[PDB]
Structure formats: C-alpha cells, structure tokens
C-alpha cells in the first residue's frame, strides 16, 4: 500500500506537468486548451497507458525487444529511442538554467527585483517587467544575437553548469521526501497565489472556453503531443520500468489512479500560474495576454516574481529551484538510463563495455546540447521542442497501437491480460485499442502534417532553412520502421509468402507455422472487434 503511493507519485509530478504546461495554456488561451486535453485524456492516453503497461509487464523485455509479437514492426523500437535522446538534448538546459538561478539565490537582495543595473534597458517600467529583462539579458544575453543564423560562441558560465549537470549524470548511470516536496512547494504557492488581490480576473479567463479557437488545429496538436508528455507513453520508458515489475501485478488500477492524480496536479498547475499572471497583469495594467510572450521561458519569468512578492523571498527561492533542480535531474535520468538499457539489451555486442558506452553516450548529449548555450539559445531550444516529439511522437504511438492490435489480436491481447492478473478487459478497453483511438491518432497526425504553422519566438519569424532542417530531423526519427521493416522483408528466405508469414506471424508459433498453420492468412482475425 506504501510501495503503491510512492510509486504513483513517481508517476505524478514532472517536469512536463510543471514546465511544460502552463506554457501550453498560455499559448492557446487557458480554456480552449483545457477542453481538448480532458477530451483526448479520457479517450487516447488512459487507454494507451493500461496497454504500455500491461504489454510491457508481460513480455517482459526491453523496449524494442518486446516486439516478437509482430516482427515486422521492430523499427519502432529504435523510433522511440531517437526520440528520447532528442528530447534529453533539450532537458539538459533547463536543469542547466536551474542550477544557475539557484547559485544566482544566495543573496540577501535578489537581482530579478528591479531595473537599475548593467543589463537593463531604458525601456523598463518597473515597458519590461525586471523578471523578463533579467532573464533575457543577464541569463542568457538574448539582444545580442541577430537570430538562427549568428549564434556565436557559448557562454562559459552556462557551460560551468552543464558540465556539473552531466557529470553528476554519468556518476548516477554508470527518498521520501524527493517525491513530496514539489507539493508542499506547490501549495504553499497556491495560497499566496489566491490570496493575492487582482487574481480572481485570472482564474475567470483561466475557467473559460472561447469557442473561435476551438476551430483551429494548433489546439488539438498541442493537446495530443501533451497527454503524451505528460503521462509518458511514446518514449518506451514505460515499458522498460515494467520490465523489472511484479508478474502477477494489477494494472487496470495502476493505469487509472496515475492518470487522475496526473490530470489533478496539472490543473492545479495552469490553476496557479494563470492566477498569478492575473495578478501581475492587474499590477502592471495591461492585458493577460501581454504581460508575457509565450515561449518555452514561462516559468522562469512568472514564478520568480512570485517568490520576490512572499515574505523572506531568498529561503523560499532556494526551495523552490532545489525542487526543479531534483525534477529536472529525475526526468532526464529515467529517459536516458531507457536509452542506454535498450541499445544495451538489444545489441550483443556491448555486453561487458557498458562504462565505455555509457561515457560516449554521455559525451555525445553533452557535445550536441553545448548548441543551446549560446547567444541565441532560445531559437535552437524553440526549434528542438517544436520539432524533436511533434508528429514523430504519434506517428510511433500510432504505428504501435495498430501494431500490437490489429497485428497480434485483440482477443490474444485480452488472453495474455487474463493469464496475467485475475479478471479480463470489458469491452471498453477492447473497442478503445482497436478502433477509437488509432481513428483518433491517424486524424491527429493527418492534421499536423497538412497545416503550415511554422515555429516563432515573439516577434520573430524563423526563415525557411530552420524549417526544413526541422523537417529533417523529425523525418529522421519518423523513418526507421520502413527500413528496418524493408530489410527484415529481404533478410527473410523462402517466397514472397513464407517472407511475410514469418515477418507478421508471432515468433512464439515457430513451430506451427512451419506447418501451414498462418493466423493472419484469413479473414477472421481480422473481424475481430
Ligand atoms: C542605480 O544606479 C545608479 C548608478 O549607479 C544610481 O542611481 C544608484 O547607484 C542606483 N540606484 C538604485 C535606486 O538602485
Ligand atoms: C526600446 O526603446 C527604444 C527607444 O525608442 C526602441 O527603439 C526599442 O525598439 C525598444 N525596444 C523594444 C524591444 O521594442
């Protein structure tokens, strides 16, 4: 009972849940974007998180050696680990930033607090709140790079806590209070937050659909690629915690307490953000939707003014970035020790040099997030977060739901969950994996790839090269199951009709498929709701 609310709270609180989505909220309204997410929630992510779960404690393999139920389909293995390394490229600099406002917080007067040193500008109105000048100029000094095409070289006082980021990253890959401070932290800022005067107008536009927007397509994107961030499927990390799980295990209760608890704290974090922005909005009398730009940066100048307004600011600022600092660490620690089991598992090679793997893997993410450092830092970061899980995420979720489903048998599916726990899936969850949400994810996809929607940060607008190398990267990930799909087809001897009898048929009927015996060479089968 202990063991399972310790682990639901692993599962809880993020860095998704925290950074991530108010950013999201701000981006499209507060409302518009509240009802989608619920929407895709209850239908797509629950469904997908008992499935990952339940797939992954039966089989009992690693991330991409599950896939001996549908041969064929083994690229999106490798799918998924591209992009968790993609992702922990760019989840390194935000522990980087942490660490250096926390270094930055030992001090009797805070420097984010007013406009009269060397890096503000004339035109703060403490205009530019001293929070976003602060941040933009003496963090990472942000006006002196034109855009993406003049970088220059990267800062040696960020590169100061990359280095300690990714050595104490290696150490850890070569507890109760970690999992509740975040909400100790978080409620004791919600009270201010409420109390606070000038809020009440931002939890009214925060509590508020505008049905215009609800017509457009950025919303649903966003919302889909949300869910996925937020519960944790589509990276193969689920699947490699299960491997080490309990066989006899129940997981319809372990796949729904972790989407509600999930679901609450994510409200509760656009709930305070939203009303602090109210809050400082009323103070500065401007509107809510110009009293910050919305780039991935949200979190860094909203709470921060949060804690210079509570009484002995300087404790509260240590807590707090000591709290990011632990998530931070946690949530690029679990996707890289899943990169690291999954090339180790799946490869015979480096059975015994794990160290020398280990440390060149390390090096790589360090050499290729060194990019984000730089002047202009936050148009690299802008491109990596728009484009590294973007449609490539579902484009994986997707390939393995109809995968595992259509492929291996709904009813096979269910009998593996009956062998494993006591009951069987009722007909919801049966109907959910088979038509409801791969007829969801295609419609997602579809919609994403179609509309234009090129990536900006404020004013500015990236040309079309950062587009197109975009494009590439996540084309990059994207195409890894039809090669591997294509090579499989070809390694394969016989005919063309024993070739895919052994690529689609389950490696466990070795023995009878030799003897005539195809499931999938039928009708059937696939009829099979
Ligand atoms: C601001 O800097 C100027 C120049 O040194 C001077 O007025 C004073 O040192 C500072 N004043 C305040 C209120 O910080
Ligand atoms: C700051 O004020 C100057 C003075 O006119 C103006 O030229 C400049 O555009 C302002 N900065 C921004 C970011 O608008």
Same mark, same amino acid.
């Given at each position: ?355 020398? *793997? &280990? %440390?060149?893997?390390?090096? @790589?993410?360090?050499?290729?997030? /060194? #990019?984000? +450092?730089?002047?202009?830092? $936050?148009? !690299? *970061? &802008? %491109?990596?977060?728009?484009? @590294?899980?973007?449609?490539?995420? /579902? #484009?994986? +979720?997707?390939?393995?739901? $109809?995968? !595992? ?125």
């Amino acid at each position: 009972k202990i063991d399972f609310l310790l682990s639901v709270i692993g599962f809880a609180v993020d860095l998704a849940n925290v950074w991530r989505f108010p950013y999201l909220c701000y981006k499209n309204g507060g409302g518009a974007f509240l009802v989608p997410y619920l929407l895709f929630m209850v239908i797509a992510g629950m469904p997908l998180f008992y499935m990952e779960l339940a797939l992954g404690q039966f089989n009992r393999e690693g991330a991409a050696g599950v896939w001996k139920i549908c041969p064929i389909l083994k690229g999106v293995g490798f799918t998924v680990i591209l992009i968790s390394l993609y992702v922990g490229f760019f989840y390194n600099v935000i522990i980087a930033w942490a660490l250096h406002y926390l270094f930055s917080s030992f001090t009797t007067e805070l420097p984010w607090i007013h406009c009269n040193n060397s890096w503000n500008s004339p035109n703060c109105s403490d205009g530019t709140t001293p929070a976003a000048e602060y941040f933009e100029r003496g963090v990472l000094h942000l006006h002196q790079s034109h855009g993406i095409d003049d970088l220059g070289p990267p800062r040696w006082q960020l590169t100061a806590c990359l280095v300690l980021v990714i050595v104490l990253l290696y150490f850890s890959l070569w507890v109760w209070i970690t999992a509740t401070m975040p909400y100790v932290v978080l409620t004791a800022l919600l009270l201010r937050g409420v109390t606070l005067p000038g809020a009440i107008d931002g939890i009214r536009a925060y509590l508020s659909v505008d049905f215009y927007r609800l017509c457009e397509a950025s919303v649903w994107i966003d919302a889909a690629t949300q869910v996925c961030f937020s519960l944790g499927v589509g990276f193969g990390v689920l699947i490699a915690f299960s491997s080490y799980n309990k066989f006899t295990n129940n997981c319809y209760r372990d796949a729904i307490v972790t989407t509600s608890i999930n679901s609450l704290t994510s409200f509760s974090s656009g709930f305070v953000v939203f009303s602090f922005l109210g809050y400082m909005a009323q103070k500065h009398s401007v509107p809510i939707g110009d009293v910050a730009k919305d780039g991935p940066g949200l979190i860094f100048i909203i709470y921060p003014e949060a804690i210079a307004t509570l009484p002995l600011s300087s404790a509260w600022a240590v807590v707090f970035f000591i709290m990011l600092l632990t998530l931070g660490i946690d949530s690029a620690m679990g996707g890289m020790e899943s990169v690291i089991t999954g090339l180790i598992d799946e490869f015979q090679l480096l059975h015994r040099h794990r160290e020398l *793997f &280990t %440390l060149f893997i390390v090096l @790589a993410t360090f050499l290729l997030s /060194l #990019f984000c +450092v730089t002047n202009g830092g $936050i148009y !690299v *970061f &802008t %491109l990596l977060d728009h484009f @590294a899980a973007g449609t490539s995420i /579902l #484009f994986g +979720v997707l390939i393995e739901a $109809i995968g !595992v489903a259509w492929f291996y048998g709904v009813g096979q599916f269910s009998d593996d969950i009956q062998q494993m726990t006591g009951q069987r899936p009722s007909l919801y969850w049966r109907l959910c994996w088979k038509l409801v949400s791969p007829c969801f994810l295609l419609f997602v996809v579809v919609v994403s790839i179609v509309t234009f929607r090129p990536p900006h940060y404020g004013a500015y607008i990236f040309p079309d090269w950062a587009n197109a190398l975009g494009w590439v990267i996540a084309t990059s990930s994207m195409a890894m199951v039809p090669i591997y799909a294509a090579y499989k087809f070809c390694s394969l001897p016989g005919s063309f009709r024993e070739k895919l009898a052994y690529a689609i048929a389950p490696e466990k009927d070795r023995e009878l498929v030799d003897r005539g015996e195809v499931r999938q060479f039928t009708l059937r089968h696939w009829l099979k709701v």
